[PDB]
Each structure stands twice: as structure tokens, then as C-alpha cells.
Structure 1
Amino acid sequence: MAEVIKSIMRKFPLGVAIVTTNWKGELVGMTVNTFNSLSLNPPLVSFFADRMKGNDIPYKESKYFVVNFTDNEELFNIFALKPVKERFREIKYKEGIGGCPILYDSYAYIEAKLYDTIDVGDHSIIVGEVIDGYQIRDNFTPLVYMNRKYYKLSSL
């Protein structure tokens, strides 16, 4: 059933973002395709963090996280492929709420306070309450992830 899920999801296009946090002083983040809005009242957003890889731990142990929306495919690859210690060496960033890194190449971001975490199977649902949101750049090319690739939309 695992390979059934992967085969169908491979052809199921999903928006991508880079979630980050300041985990006891360590700047960390990751490319995710599970980001969404969950609730409006209260205003909550969520993503799924892999428990087997320990991706849930930083968010569970930090009071805040940032969701970075970017159209730079290089950034998505960095925050998926490169060693954790190397990720924040190559990119321009500033610190935001709780010291969470805001990526310079983001056209928008959300600052969230950790609201809840719910372990369900081999992932944890990380839920943040939206404290602030920013649209920094109005001209961007939104990407979606499908079949290991990052596509632009035909046509806008």
C-alpha cells in the first residue's frame, strides 16, 4: 500500500514551501509539499513532519515556525537535498519571530506560533497559529511539485 500511495502521489501536483525554525539556536528548515491552511477561526496552518527522519523534533521543541513561499527552485533543492549544516551558509536570510529564519528570496511568508502537534502514523501534524503574514513581492512565478519536478502553471 506504501507503493500505491507513492505512485498516485507522483502524479498529484502539490504546492511547495520551505518551513523553518530556530531550534535552540540552530537554524533549520525543510522543503515540504504538505503545507496547507487548516482553520480560519482560529487562524491555523499545518504541515506534516516525518517522525522516522526526526523532522518533527525541531518544531515540537520550538515555540514558532516560519513558512517561506518562494519561486526559486534552487532553494527547494537546498532545503530537500543538502546537509543540514550547509543550508543557511548559501542563502540570504534574516531572523524573525523567535529567531526563525525568513528567506530573502521568499515572495511571501507566514509567522506562526506552535499551536499543536499530533502524531498520526509515521508523521506528526505540525499546526501553527498565524501571528503575522507578509506579501513582500507581487511579481512571482508559483511552482508546483509533481513527479520529482517543479512546474510553472500554464498559464499564470
Structure 2
Amino acid sequence: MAEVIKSIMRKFPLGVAIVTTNWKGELVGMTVNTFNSLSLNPPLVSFFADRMKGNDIPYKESKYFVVNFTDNEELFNIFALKPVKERFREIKYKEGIGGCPILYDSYAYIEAKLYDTIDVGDHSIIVGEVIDGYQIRDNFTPLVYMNRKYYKLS
């Protein structure tokens, strides 16, 4: 079989973010490399959630979600590798719209309201309608994921 299709994606640089929500009282988040702007009028953003792993379910059952933009590699690792029950013990967060956690170490975030979801193959596209966003820290180092690694920008 051609699994050259995975090898090409591993060399394709992608921006990363951490999406959180409050899921019936349970604080959850995850590192994503599928976040993007989908539409400007109306202002929709989206990301892709893995259905096999059940990453889609939390966001399908909540009304809001926050996109956290940060430059601390360690946080990306926490929200990809640590057990789900341990994630919010180790970091500083404040509560935001609908109880959703905003990471303290974010340089920016966007709060959004779930707008639609769409199952395509083994992922769902989760679309949210933007309702606010703030730039908090002005001086930061944006990161990209490529080949299991995070790179600063040249």
C-alpha cells in the first residue's frame, strides 16, 4: 500500500493551537494542527476531531469552545500526551465563556460558539461561530508542527 501519503504530511508544516471546552463540568482540551479560518462573514473557525479516539464527542455536546494560541512547547505536549484527568492540575487557567478554560500562558485566544459539525471519513469538522478574541501578549514566538517537532519561524 501507498503510505507515502503520511510521509508527505510529515514534511508539511502546520500551525498548532489548543482547543478547550467545558464538557458537562469536565474541563478538556487538546493540541490540534487542523485549526483554521473557514469564513469571514459570518466569522467561522474550524478544526478536525478524530472520531476513532472520540475527540469529537466533547465538542459535539458543548455549546462553546476556546482556541488558545500559545508559544510554550510544554503545553502542546501536555494537551497531547498527559492523561485527560491530569491536564488542568498542572497549568494555570481562568474560566471564560460557558465555563471554558482559557490558558494563562496564551498570547491570544478566540471564544466561539458551536455552529455545526460534519462527519467525513474518520474525522468530524467542528465549526464554531466566533464571538470574541483578544490579543493579550504582544511579543511572542509563533510555532509550527512538522515531523513530530516544533520549530520557531526563520
Length-normalised TM-score, structure 2: 0.98
Measured after TM superposition, the shift of residue 20 of structure 1 is 0.3
Offset from partner CA, 1:51-88 (integer Å, 9 cap, x none): 00000000000000000000000000000000000000
Alignment partners' CA distance in 2, 1:38 and 1:76: 23
Alignment partners' CA distance in 2, 1:4 and 1:61: 35
Offset from partner CA, 1:11-58 (integer Å, 9 cap, x none): 000000000000000000000000000000000000000000000000
Moved more, 130-139 or 3-12: 3-12
The gaps in structure 1 that reach 5 residues or longer are none
Alignment partners' CA distance in 2, 1:92 and 1:125: 28
1:48 equivalent in alignment to 2:48: yes
Offset from partner CA, 1:94-144 (integer Å, 9 cap, x none): 010110000000000000000000000000000000000010000000000
Alignment partners' CA distance in 2, 1:2 and 1:58: 33
Q: CA RMSD in A?
A: 1.0
Measured after TM superposition, the shift of residue 6 of structure 1 is 1.4
The gaps in structure 2 that reach 5 residues or longer are none
Distance 1:115 1:9, change over 3 A: same
Equivalent in the alignment of 1:113: 113
Equivalent in the alignment of 1:24: 24
Alignment partners' CA distance in 1, 2:118 and 2:76: 25
Alignment partners' CA distance in 2, 1:99 and 1:26: 10
Moved over 3 A (4+): none
Measured after TM superposition, the shift of residue 2 of structure 1 is 7.1
Alignment partners' CA distance in 1, 2:125 and 2:142: 24
Alignment partners' CA distance in 2, 1:2 and 1:141: 36
User: SS of the residue aligned with 1:83?
Assistant: coil
Alignment partners' CA distance in 2, 1:151 and 1:44: 27
Measured after TM superposition, the shift of residue 5 of structure 1 is 2.5
Alignment partners' CA distance in 2, 1:51 and 1:60: 11
Which is helix-richer, 1 or 2? 1
Alignment partners' CA distance in 2, 1:8 and 1:33: 15
User: SS of the residue aligned with 2:62?
Assistant: coil
Length-normalised TM-score, structure 1: 0.97
User: SS of the residue aligned with 1:88?
Assistant: coil
